[PDB]
Amino acid sequence: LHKEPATLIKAIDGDTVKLMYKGQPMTFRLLLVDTPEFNEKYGPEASAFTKKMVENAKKIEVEFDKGQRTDKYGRGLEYIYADGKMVNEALVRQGLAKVAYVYKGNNTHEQLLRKAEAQAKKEKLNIWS
Ligand SMILES: Cc1cn([C@H]2C[C@H](OP(=O)(O)O)[C@@H](COP(=O)(O)O)O2)c(=O)[nH]c1=O
Ligand SMILES: [Ca+2]
């Protein structure tokens, strides 16, 4: 897997970000995770967390997996890094996302994310409290 440059256009919610990628605006949906919708409990904290993370970052990168790069809505499917920290993992580690939407072929970082979910659950953080 490889990291590619992109630039923040707009934070959207906990697990969707608008980024400019190869000079085109695209909506990017985070692989392997599900944040609450803004209207649900922890949804605002998940949107807030992703927002800070991507807005504070000096360098945003996207990393596609081995499988589909777009979903059926035309959204990118990817891992996002904020100054080398994976957003997908960080949300799960804080108990602001669950591991979800694990489809074979786009699941390189599954174990890593499950490990973080385990430690979040252990600490009873946020969604696990
Ligand atoms: C994360 C992810 C979501 N999706 C689709 C499945 C879901 O379809 P349905 O909309 O038909 O339920 C939807 C969930 O996205 P959100 O959690 O953003 O709503 O996005 C994929 O197809 N592949 C993926 O890797
Ligand atoms: Ca969601």
Tell me the C-alpha distance between 62 and 76, whole Å: 10
Q: Tell how far the Cα of 42 is from the centroid of ligand 2, in angstroms.
A: 11
CB 20 within 8 A of CB 7: yes
CB 30 within 8 A of CB 72: no
Q: Strand 85-86 vs strand 16-21: parallel, antiparallel, or unpaired? A: unpaired
Ligand 2 ion: Cβ-proximal residues, 5 Å cutoff: 34-35
Give, using CA atoms, the residue closest to atom 22 of ligand 1.
Answer: 71
User: 100-106: which pairs have CB atoms within 8 A and are 24 or more residues apart?
Assistant: 100/32, 100/33, 100/34, 101/31, 101/32, 101/33, 101/34, 102/32, 103/67, 103/68, 104/67, 105/65, 105/66, 105/67, 105/68, 106/31, 106/32, 106/65, 106/66, 106/67, 106/68, 106/77
Tell me the C-alpha distance between 38 and 42, whole Å: 8
Extents of the domains making up the chain: 1-129
Residues linked to residue 110 through DSSP beta bridges, in sequence order: none
Q: Is 7 annotated as a binding residue?
A: no
Tell me the C-alpha distance between 85 and 50, whole Å: 12
- By C-alpha distance, which of 85, 88, 109, 84 is closest to 98? 88
Please tell me the experimental approach by which this structure was elucidated: X-ray
Ligand 1 probe mutation, 15, 68, 72, 88, most atoms within 8 A of CB: 72
Give, using CA atoms, the residue closest to atom 8 of ligand 1.
Answer: 72
Domain 1-129 is in which class? mainly beta
